[model samples]
Target: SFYSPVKAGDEPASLVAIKSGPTTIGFGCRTKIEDCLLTAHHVWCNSMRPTGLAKAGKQVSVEDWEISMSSSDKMLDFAIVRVPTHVWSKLGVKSTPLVCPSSKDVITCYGGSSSDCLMSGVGSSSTSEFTWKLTHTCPTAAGWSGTPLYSSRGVVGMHVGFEEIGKLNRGVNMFYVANYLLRS
Candidate 1:
């Protein structure tokens, strides 16, 4: 019934974080391979475009990793970056990807500033661009940039944009569904 706030022990293998450092600014999904990651390419871009790996993160730096794919459809908003090594190996991670739910199922957003860092994934890090009253939880924050928005079955999307309207409706830009992209 609930599909938010991914737990730590739930799927250690797929807990991808889009971070500038210890802090995560976005999220992504880990693939079956020991050295693969998937996310909305914009997370790795500079001018808000998915240009290359500099925006991806340390595990995906140009020096070590490679950009395998970037969708041409802006509407699709999806990309896959490949890392030669498993990041989880460094963290001693060994969990499996969450199971993605069928269309119309609920997926709760678990991690927010209310737990790990002093930030909120529900709202913008600043009032400059976003203005949403984001959810408060652990693991989700400004540092969660490249984080993966996972489903229990697998990966469904990634956290990209957010818009806070008053203290209620927080419009977040989740990763475009790959199925739709395939259709287009």
Candidate 2:
């Protein structure tokens, strides 16, 4: 279950999909020249050792990453990792995704929450862990735990968890907080 409420102008330019172990994590944000990557703490926490690099089309080595500056006590999950400068440097003059609000930007928002967009991933229904499945209308499954929630502008948030309303089989839900990420 997921719930995202972002306006059109609120989307970020870059949306990264991380491949770790048997799962992939996705998150979105707006940033400056410096990127601010965010993921679920559950995705990386408890790991005996940290991993490196994220893969969109293929696996690429990473430079550096950090934990989410903020923690979600209720879920024991939350992480915000920054791409290493060296990695970006090695990317060989590739266009980096937009970080966030520009210096001249006075506001950021998303399109209609009801806007029909697509969420893709390789996850399952048994659990929110590993499997490859993509769908429309918000019902994201396992393996997509950290899938990036993309908007027309770009990335707006991640597939943190679900948003349930009684017993409705409407579809999977996504919870994203682009606004919160933009805050200092």
Candidate 3:
């Protein structure tokens, strides 16, 4: 039910599959550091609570390249990961945009081995008691968490949630990401 048109560089090139051991858990996007990725902390745990295979210093595999953990921000609900620079250098890198999205915009995200790239119109913006997030039309599944959400400008945010309760897809704005990664 979700589909999209990709422009610029290939979307899947920037995407990375997140694995906690053998089973893939979600996805991550390349960012500022060649060895670092933009991620949702909950992929490891919800609000810093280590659950299942999600935890700090855990050995997570991405693209069959060896990778590990980095910083986990509780306030923003995003985490940083260390990847193989030489290996990830062969993939796509996202330019984290500083602006916010609107209902008039369109966003696309990619994940899974076959590359499930889906697109939908922007929904609206909202925030939790923790940090800011938005409702978008993109479809997300179990392994889609931490997937990159991109606009024409660049990487707008990271896909954070999909609730059957409201059936709304959510994205964590890039502000927290840029603040954490792009200190400049």
**Top-down lDDT ranking:** 3, 1, 2
Top candidate when judged by lDDT against the true structure: 3
> Ranking under TM-score, best-scoring first?
3, 1, 2
TM-score of each prediction: 0.51, 0.48, 0.61
User: Between prediction 2 and prediction 3, which has the larger lDDT?
Assistant: 3
Better of 1 and 2 by lDDT: 1
TM-score of 3: 0.61
Backbone clash numbers for all candidates listed: 46, 35, 0
lDDT of 2 at 47: 34
Summarize candidate 3's per-residue lDDT along 80-123 as a digit string, tens digits.
65555654544434334345555445666665432333332333
Model 1: per-residue Cα lDDT over 80-130, one tens digit each: 666545444554334444233333323333333222222222222211122
Q: Quantify all predictions' global Cα lDDT against the true fold.
A: 0.39, 0.36, 0.54
Question: Candidate 2: lDDT of 101?
Answer: 19
Q: Please list the residue runs of candidate 3 whose C-alpha ends up more than 4 Å from where it truly belongs after superposition.
A: 3-10, 33-35, 45-75, 90-103, 113-131, 163-166, 180-184
Q: List runs of model 2 lying over 4 Å from the truth.
A: 1-13, 21-34, 46-50, 61-64, 89-136, 165-184
